[model samples]
Target: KVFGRCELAAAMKRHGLDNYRGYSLGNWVCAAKFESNFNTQATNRNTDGSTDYGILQINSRWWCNDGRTPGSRNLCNIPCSALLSSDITASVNCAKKIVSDGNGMNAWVAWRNRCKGTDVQAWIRGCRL
Candidate 1:
């Protein structure tokens, strides 16, 4: 499902990502926008045969195990299929792990390229979370 701006904001808020790790909800919102456009089914394949899943684009190589990515670390210990569900609990929780691992939001290149350092508030401008 494709989420509206405020919709995604509220979802992230519910998942404790609003002020997570000193990053505002805007960063999460912006990252989601560029990562998957709030698409629950969004999937991106990497050159190394790993795949990204769901709205937050959790990577199979490090976060989830899709049973296809060789040597997947499965840090999140969740099946990649869980990230594809509309619930988003798995995605948000896994994303939290990514940030807490000291990588910050830079794990998502789309966030670094499209949502970093600028005024990201616009990503959730009209949303009241």
Candidate 2:
């Protein structure tokens, strides 16, 4: 149901991550570790009727349900088990767009780092983890 290492790499590969040696993976894994602890079924309320879900904490109610892009099914989808339906990379890629505007992880890096990339170690050192 969830990802460990190899699964993460497969997900990242689907996103066309050409840079196997980047730092975005570190940032993504950090966000996952900090937010949902890598739980695919995790959910949380923001005290505003909105809800966040999945490993990367992709707000399902807002973005995937009644939000701007309804049924978008990106990485943050609450029912992330259906990740195979769409491009898993697309979800994280879109979030990266919102978070860093292309300066952050480029979709593939997010999964790679959070899933199994080695760059996460550097991120921990940088963030003093």
Candidate 3:
């Protein structure tokens, strides 16, 4: 999606969380929405774009300690979108790291706690990370 496989593989190895395949994107999206509304173009340049990225919305700059550049592939790698071009597991893996490194689903848990109770809220509900 960016340029080539080298960059893609590098991104995966760099930003991917351990046991990434185990989690579901639905769970990941909840955390991302709470964090950045799933805006891959979203950036915190002041903090070097560590704030968010992609569908899973990983903060590549923060976790990977890489300087973020607007429009730069590696700078703002979105694992969610990457998965579409590669594999869903990639996005899930990215979400796993983002969650594991941060609150570990607290946001998603709270979301579930509040919304999951009602059927009308199922779609609106999300797992906390």
For candidate 2, what is the lDDT?
0.48
Better of 2 and 3 by lDDT: 2
* Candidate 1 pairs with clashing backbones: none
lDDT of 2 by residue, 67-123 (tens): 534444443343433322333553555454445444444333444455454455443
Put the candidates in TM-score order, highest first.
1, 2, 3
Clashes of each: 0, 2, 11
Pairwise TM-score winner, candidates 1 and 2: 1
**Per-residue lDDT for 1-129 in model 3, tens only?**
332223332343455532254543334333445434444344343354444444344444433333444433442254323533333345555555545655555424433553333342232234222
Report the error of model 3 at residue 43, Å: 4.3
TM-score (C-alpha, index-matched) for candidate 2: 0.49
Q: Highest TM-score: give the candidate number.
A: 1
Taken over the whole model, the C-alpha lDDT of each candidate is: 0.91, 0.48, 0.41
Error of 3 at 102 (Å): 7.2
**Residue-level error in angstroms, candidate 1, position 80:** 0.3
The digit string of per-residue lDDT tens for model 1 on 1-129 reads 888889989999988889999999899999999889899899989999999999988899899989999888999999999998979889999999999988799998999999899899988887775
**Lowest lDDT block of 10, candidate 1:** 120-129
**Candidates 1 and 2: which is better by lDDT?**
1
